Design a protein around this ligand. Structure first.
Ligand code: Y01
Ligand code: Y01
Ligand code: Y01
Ligand code: Y01
Ligand code: Y01
Ligand code: D12
Ligand code: D12
Ligand code: D12
Ligand code: D12
Ligand code: D12
Ligand code: D12
Ligand code: D12
Ligand code: D12
Ligand code: CL
Ligand code: CL
Ligand code: CL
Ligand code: CL
Ligand code: CL
Ligand code: CL
Ligand code: CL
Lengths: 313, 313, 313, 313, 313
């Protein structure tokens, strides 16, 4: 068929849209994608479908999608076209069509890892419709039809809210008007997992590097094992940790924590080398170095942790 | 076709549901998903299809899905719509339709890892139907049609039971009634694998750390190698072990066992450092520290293992 | 159409089945699945399709699948419904339908890892048919139509035979009679790969641990390096090896070999600790301990290897 | 239908093409593939579809793809045929068809890793059409119809431009004329990630190897630990780094940096072995070797880094 | 439709086949599969479709696949049925059909790793056609229609040739004649990648093991670190390397190189143990052992590399 002609002859047809989240899963940090399963509801007026509720013995009447004109509604930030099962189509005597489908889709939405793993994100789902030559078509948001099931979970996140920006973006694209709505799922990451995956190994590796200051300065190999293994451990943890993220250009909050831990451990190595350098000549100097280090290192590290955890929580 | 009109004019149409598990596989702890292949049986009354059992020499008669109205039944907590092959449709003389399909689906159901790897789970499969404008449709459970084949296996688990909650959850959603049933597969994990994957490496690594107390106090590098490699091994096992799980915030029972093992090993490091601190001056104190440690450590560790394994078995 | 009515009025229709393996691949030990690509041949009698071979100038005549009744044949132990292309349908003058399709499927079959990697398996392909309300349907095996192409290979396995159990298993399921056939692909694993993936690292790691008995007792750190690295290597090989298998409860033959190797290595550690414990006081005892160990350890290890490889080969 | 006959009887029909990038994701360096989601626009002349704009009260008129002849346009460097949803088909009074589809595809395009990770690439998308027996078909580029949305991102790259080579490549293939267009997405890699993934571990590992020159020459085990672990670390980092790339024959810029770092580290090992060789006999020589090394190594390494980072930036 | 009747009443219908490779990708050594995107061209004679070239003013005329009989051509060694888009079907006045499709497929073809990574392979694509009851059908090869695009690449390989074995294998299968063609893609591996992935780490690890002979015999821990870490490095490199291949029974050329390197490294270990054994008593003997070893080991290793690289290049 063709689109409903305008009664005002010059009026845009608006399609009232709503999304109801049923299932939300597979939030992939590295791919910056997530999978969503929801209701899509569309509503518009096609007076061609009007009918007498009495002559037609039905209060509503229901159609197959093949029977009537339906707006071509597409998702933008999706990998493939969604998979949809039309659920219901109900017309009113005045021509008001209420369309309901259930869809699943792989949404592509970029993440801001700067504050990671203390990050919040806005996942976006962009709806769009392209105007035909006979009529311009415009999207709108029916707030009654937006929401999400209570049993919606992302197994590592707190889900804040699912809302829609009511005023759409209308613009020209290849000589036709396109109309775009922005559905926004706000989430904030649950960082605790990482505390025992990365932060604790880091803190313990720093402490372990500091244990070397209490070993006798003459047992040089022992202190060597301490200093060297803690340096290699920091390097391994650093690489491992950045392996969870996409190849982002910037540095994360975890990056800063790991880099400072690497600073403390490598400084313990430099301290061991200096102390070893002054042990025969000027043993008083070496002894003073260890005496001060045993207090300074764990103090600067404690203060650092205070500023860090105070800041990012 | 169209939905069966009510005889009582105000009676909800109930559809009797049953699921019979044929194959159960791919229980993914990290994805919190599993795959199921089963019979779905639905049964309802459409008097329009009734017929005289004597005038018609046939006892049942069978239709194709296109011939008669069939209720649209959806799964809720699933990733894509199921793949189903209709098996049979048999109408009764009184108008009772018995529908049978075989379907496969990827179900998404969250797991409770707090007690892991000594955990039990309830996998859920939610059936749902949305009411039409002409009639409300309500789900119910035919126990004769619920079960699972005996040769059904989840390799890492014991399958306890497959049952259904008979009273459905009926509620309003986007201005129509939905009726939702909760099918429940109860399972409990087989922990033995993990005993030799993680628990043994941990217990042996704690013992290894304790061997250092019997080495000569003067051979500082040897004891250093013992202490340091056991600390790094504990960390490695911690990270490795948590890699099996989704990014849950909390701690598993395995987490507690590993954390206490880390406590014993790091305590062995602190002991080595203390003994080394007193080896030249006050060799009696250092010697006594080794003497007590050699009894306390394996004893406290044995007691801990006793309380832990007594608790979680 | 409808199912072929019985000539004896009470006789079950048997469907003669055959499978011809064309391609066999992706035998996944962890997933307990494999992929199969084969011919499925069915043959039954439908008198309605008989015809005069002389009046009709054709010796066979061929139908389209939509033209005639075809039995619904399903695989049981499969993940999704198979993918099939109907190849040919030939009716005989008497009504004998010979149906031929080519299908691919992902078969789900449990593996018995107890004797692994010296294990044999039976991969199963269960065919099944459900009786309709008009007639009971029963499966049988046409031996002429069972076999496999010679260039069928499972890269890690020797394929012994592909045969079928002629008598089917008939049983009641949800108030109808079902008929189930068991096609059996027998395979036996080629263990050589594992000899150089796991068995050699283990044997050499044990030997390496035994070299420590020949090092000077006064050079404590050297012997520490030997003993400790060999223990951690054994643990690493153990975890690595068990990562190839599903989360089975039991122990494999490889588990036993690795565990005994771990016994030898940890025993060498305990020996080094005893010798070190007796080195200052009672150097004769320490020396005697090493003297005996250098003969006992590699001797008991050789004997063990003799029993092990004699048993599992 | 059939293809439009030529007005000149011997004139090729040109199809004006355009691509508008909507989504660009999953650029896999190892697979040398990327995924694209875009508009494909085609435009050509079919006089059979011309019409009087006055007798027909419509200014454009729109057809279904089944109604009119549409040119078969294929992508060359793609894995499967694209997935396309026809969006709009608009005929003009003169017979000018404006066709618009939205497609997703997995494009296969080779990468030049010689300058990696400081590399720029040209991803190619080849359009092609095969001439029919009735008429030759030739592709062209409608610049109005080429572009890309501003929010297009490759989460690891800077996107320079998306342009088309206007002149197509015409050639004979299996006795017919083919016409091929080259759409080119120019991108350049964001190397910063790799600086902290590989370049820093390498630089620090070289520095660590240099610390050994400041340890007392008599503490041979300590220096052994430094030298040996830094060499093995270089090897591990090399293997890890080359694991991100396809099995390319040549060497990348990163290969060179890692190889020079390996030169410096192995040179420190060779230095330690030489120093240890001369420590008893000719200790002045050994002392001088350390004296010069402490100045030369970090100087040659700093100079090298200066030349390298100056060159590849 | 039906198959073309024979003019000779007893003549087999031949189908002239050709494949033109467009895209060749994803050669998976472990899966022994590769993906191909190509033209499939078929050509046969159906007199029923003939026409007068003069009365009919048309030189060819074109049909839709539904209009005429088309032979069912299947690939044998493929995982799923191919995905094909029919491109063109052109009949000649005499009745010669020229059919052209573009298909993609996942081909399964076994590899011979004995000479790896210096291996050449023949990837096979088997075409096959099954005879119908009315006529025997036989495959043949049209060389004009066989080839590959010049920009066809398998990263990590040299593509030698794509040819066909002209004489097909005709044989009986389940009581009908099948006709099978062997298309052969010859390739040879580019080993250079492996040179820097495995061969260099091995060679340098052997050299590193030899450095121990130049360290002072009294620094037992130092030599212990050398010998032990190099032995474990060899084991790790071995396991890593074999992880790239399927679970083949035999040994590759790379296996032999790695095994000889392990021999040299373990022999250096045995030498260190022997030298350490004779260091107190008979220092002349130990000294002589190091003196000879420092020349023999690197010499025998140089000769070995000479024979090996001379052989496999
Ligand atoms: C100039 C003389 C007198 C002193 C020579 C010693 C310096 C060369 C050392 C001392 C502290 C070292 C720094 C300690 C910490 C780091 C953090 C490290 O960053 C990371 O590891 C990033 C990890 C991540 O991003 O997750 C980079 C090297 C750097 C700057 C080191 C550079 C070399 C430094 C300056
Ligand atoms: C000055 C000397 C005398 C005492 C200083 C030593 C303390 C700082 C040590 C003693 C016990 C240690 C604790 C022992 C065990 C743990 C558990 C450990 O947790 C895990 O490894 C988690 C593993 C998992 O969850 O899988 C984190 C470090 C911690 C808190 C250690 C923190 C540092 C502690 C308090
Ligand atoms: C003689 C006294 C003074 C000191 C020894 C204390 C014992 C408690 C030690 C000595 C030998 C140890 C055993 C050495 C070998 C192993 C094999 C180990 O099994 C595995 O590693 C499983 C590997 C796999 O299954 O893949 C389990 C611990 C166990 C029994 C150890 C348990 C603790 C033992 C008995
Ligand atoms: C003269 C004697 C007394 C001692 C020196 C023996 C040589 C044989 C050493 C000195 C420098 C070494 C080279 C140092 C650096 C390299 C680059 C190295 O390349 C890499 O491993 C980088 C990894 C990558 O390419 O990604 C390969 C070994 C090699 C050629 C080494 C080969 C062995 C060499 C030539
Ligand atoms: C005091 C003297 C007589 C030595 C006594 C110890 C022997 C038992 C050692 C010395 C040399 C060793 C051999 C040195 C090298 C190897 C190669 C090794 O092969 C591999 O690692 C294969 C790796 C791969 O296939 O990739 C198998 C063990 C073996 C034969 C060793 C077996 C044990 C041997 C004979
Ligand atoms: C994270 C940086 C640590 C810096 C610690 C400086 C300690 C100075 C000790 C000097 C002793 C003479
Ligand atoms: C909310 C959990 C934070 C855990 C980290 C607390 C900071 C510990 C610092 C230890 C420094 C020695
Ligand atoms: C869970 C915490 C375990 C810590 C063990 C402490 C042992 C102290 C022994 C004191 C002997 C001197
Ligand atoms: C199936 C139960 C396995 C539990 C194993 C407990 C072993 C405790 C060892 C403690 C050694 C100190
Ligand atoms: C795996 C069991 C090894 C047992 C070796 C016994 C050696 C006894 C040596 C003690 C002599 C006093
Ligand atoms: C990349 C190669 C490093 C070469 C450094 C040589 C240093 C000179 C040592 C002088 C010894 C007396
Ligand atoms: C192919 C196996 C190589 C083994 C190398 C042994 C070299 C022996 C040298 C002994 C010198 C006394
Ligand atoms: C084609 C490149 C082959 C590389 C062979 C390197 C051989 C080095 C042997 C060194 C022996 C000491
Ligand atoms: Cl969509
Ligand atoms: Cl020492
Ligand atoms: Cl569903
Ligand atoms: Cl099936
Ligand atoms: Cl395409
Ligand atoms: Cl095929
Ligand atoms: Cl050491």
């Amino acid at each position: 068929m063709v689109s409903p002609p305008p009664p005002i002859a010059d009026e845009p047809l608006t399609v009232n849209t709503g999304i109801y989240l049923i299932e939300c899963y597979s939030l992939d940090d590295k791919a910056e994608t997530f999978k969503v399963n929801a209701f899509l509801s569309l509503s518009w007026k096609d007076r061609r479908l009007a009918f007498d509720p009495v002559r037609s013995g039905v209060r509503v009447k229901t159609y197959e999608p093949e029977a009537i004109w339906i707006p071509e509604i597409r998702f933008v930030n999706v990998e493939n076209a969604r998979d949809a099962d039309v659920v219901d189509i109900s017309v009113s005597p005045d021509g008001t069509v209420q369309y309901l489908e259930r869809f699943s889709a792989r949404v592509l939405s970029p993440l801001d890892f700067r504050r990671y793993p203390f990050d919040s994100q806005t996942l976006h789902i962009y709806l769009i419709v392209r105007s035909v030559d006979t009529r311009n078509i415009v999207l709108a948001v029916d707030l009654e039809k937006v929401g999400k099931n209570d049993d919606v979970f992302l197994t590592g996140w707190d889900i804040e809210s699912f809302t829609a920006v009511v005023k759409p973006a209308n613009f020209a694209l290849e000589d036709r008007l396109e109309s775009k709505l922005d559905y926004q799922l706000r989430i904030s990451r649950q960082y605790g997992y990482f505390v025992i995956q990365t932060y604790l190994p880091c803190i313990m590796t720093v402490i372990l590097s500091q244990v070397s200051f209490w070993l006798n300065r003459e047992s040089v190999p022992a202190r060597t094992v301490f200093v060297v293994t803690t340096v290699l451990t920091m390097t391994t943890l650093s690489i491992s940790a950045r392996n969870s993220l996409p190849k982002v250009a910037y540095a994360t909050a975890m990056d800063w924590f790991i880099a400072v831990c690497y600073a403390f451990v490598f400084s313990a190595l430099i301290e061991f080398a200096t102390v070893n350098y002054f042990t025969k000549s000027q043993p008083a100097r070496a002894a003073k170095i260890d005496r001060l280090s045993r207090i300074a290192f764990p103090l600067l590290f404690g203060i650092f942790n205070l500023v860090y955890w105070a800041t990012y929580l």
